[PDB]
């Protein structure tokens, strides 16, 4: 029999680490059907803000315009996706981009030759002026009422050293960029996650005891934190079944084809969520279980 | 194949609303192994296909 209180007893979360970008945590006694449903939302269906419409006024640089527009779209933008709503595509361009739907970014950079460069120089940062265009040169321009709600936090890119273009004197780039929401099923630039995936917990099952000098070679055929030898008797045991990459190195040696088997704990998942910069990995997983709850809630209320 | 797997492979290939079935209701078979838990052999997938 299954019940929502039977699941509430057996499920628990075992969080390993936190960081501003990466979170390592565990889900115990949950199905593969649900644990896949969480990582399929974190890649595809959790919103993020990225540049979609780029408005070139002048581009005399070497990299052409649709490629340089494509690179601005791949720049992660450190902005909270809750601060602005969705666009309506059927509206015309006069009425579609409002200040509650759209953040404006501008890039105005001109390159000129530096006459104060030393003789025989090779470094283009000294031989030229504004020779490299970075992601921090995308200046935020608040329009309308978002000069107050973004005065506490401007729209800076999450990685300000992203090299957008390279220029030589005489050349320039001048553009505007309207960045909106979107999901990772639309384009890859809206996925707020570097990677989000699980590995199941390996289960190293020592069948027969490996006492003796074969316990230094059985220990060698794993990552170093996986197998330790016992002190009271010389005996290899499992210290941590998490640290192993499942390499099956013991199956190459005919000595260990009877004494160990490599299974897998079928419900102990290890999520590894790495944020692209816009949100915390705490918040992406928290949204992804809220998206699946609202997704079933939408079908529950729609008429059949 | 367990019961969730067994009924997933049949509806993934039959799909009665496109008229591949001839009964308007997917019929199944009893499992090969009853105890300890039900399992269907993969011979029996193509039997009910």
């Amino acid at each position: 029999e299954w019940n929502v209180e039977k699941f509430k007893k057996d499920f628990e979360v075992n969080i390993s680490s936190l960081d501003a970008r990466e979170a390592n945590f565990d889900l115990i006694n949950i199905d593969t059907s649900i644990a896949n449903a969480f990582r399929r939302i974190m890649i595809s269906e959790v919103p993020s803000v990225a540049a979609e419409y780029v408005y070139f006024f002048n581009n005399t640089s070497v990299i052409q315009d649709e490629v340089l527009a494509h690179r601005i779209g791949l720049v992660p933008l450190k902005v909270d996706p809750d601060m602005l709503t969705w666009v309506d595509s059927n509206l015309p361009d006069d009425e579609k981009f409002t200040d509650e739907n759209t953040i404006v970014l501008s890039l105005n950079v001109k390159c000129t030759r530096n006459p104060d460069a030393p003789k025989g120089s090779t470094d283009p940062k000294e031989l030229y002026n504004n020779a490299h265009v970075y992601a921090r040169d995308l200046k935020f321009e608040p329009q309308g009422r978002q000069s107050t709600t973004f005065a506490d936090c401007p729209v800076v890119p999450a990685d300000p050293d992203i090299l957008l273009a390279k220029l030589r004197p005489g050349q320039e780039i001048s553009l505007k960029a309207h960045c909106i929401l979107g999901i990772g099923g639309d384009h890859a630039k809206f996925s707020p996650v570097s990677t989000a995936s699980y590995r199941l917990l390996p289960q190293i099952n020592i069948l027969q005891p490996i006492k003796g000098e074969s316990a230094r070679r059985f220990q060698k055929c794993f990552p170093p934190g996986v197998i330790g030898i016992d002190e009271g008797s010389d005996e290899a045991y499992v210290k941590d079944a998490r640290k192993d990459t499942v390499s099956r190195e013991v199956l190459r040696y005919e000595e260990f084809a009877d004494k160990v088997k490599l299974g897998r704990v079928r419900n102990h998942f290890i999520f590894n969520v790495e944020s692209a910069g816009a949100m915390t990995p705490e918040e992406i997983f928290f949204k992804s279980v809220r998206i699946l709850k609202n997704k079933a809630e939408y079908l529950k209320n729609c008429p059949i | 194949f367990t019961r969730e797997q067994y009924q997933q492979y049949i509806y993934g290939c039959i799909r009665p609303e496109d008229g591949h079935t001839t009964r308007s209701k997917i019929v199944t078979l009893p499992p090969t192994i009853f105890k300890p838990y039900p399992l269907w052999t993969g011979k029996q997938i193509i039997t009910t296909v």
Partner: protein, 98 residues
């Protein structure tokens, strides 16, 4: 027009019925299939995509009786809601302790 009962596949008794959900992938269809196969009245259940290039999703529910196939779908959507409400709480209880 999100959920739609396929009239050519339903039964007159209401025990057997197919459903067609627009713009849903394996994400919801596999999770909803697992939760309602936990119901001790569902006889048959499974999901199917007619073609991957079209954002459609069919789901069969057949039951033994004493419940219609729509009433099984409403229970499985309620219990997939509550399953996402306990993985939300215990992830919050462990991120507050940390």
């Amino acid at each position: 027009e999100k959920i739609k009962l396929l009239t050519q596949a339903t039964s007159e008794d209401g025990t057997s019925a197919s459903f067609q959900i627009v713009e849903e992938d394996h994400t919801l269809g596999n999770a909803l299939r697992y939760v309602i196969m936990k119901n001790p009245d569902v006889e048959f259940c499974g999901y199917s995509i007619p073609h991957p290039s079209e954002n459609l999703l069919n789901i069969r529910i057949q039951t033994y009786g004493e419940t219609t196939a729509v009433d099984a779908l409403q229970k499985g959507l309620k219990d997939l809601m509550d399953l996402c409400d306990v993985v939300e709480s215990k992830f919050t209880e462990k991120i507050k302790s940390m």
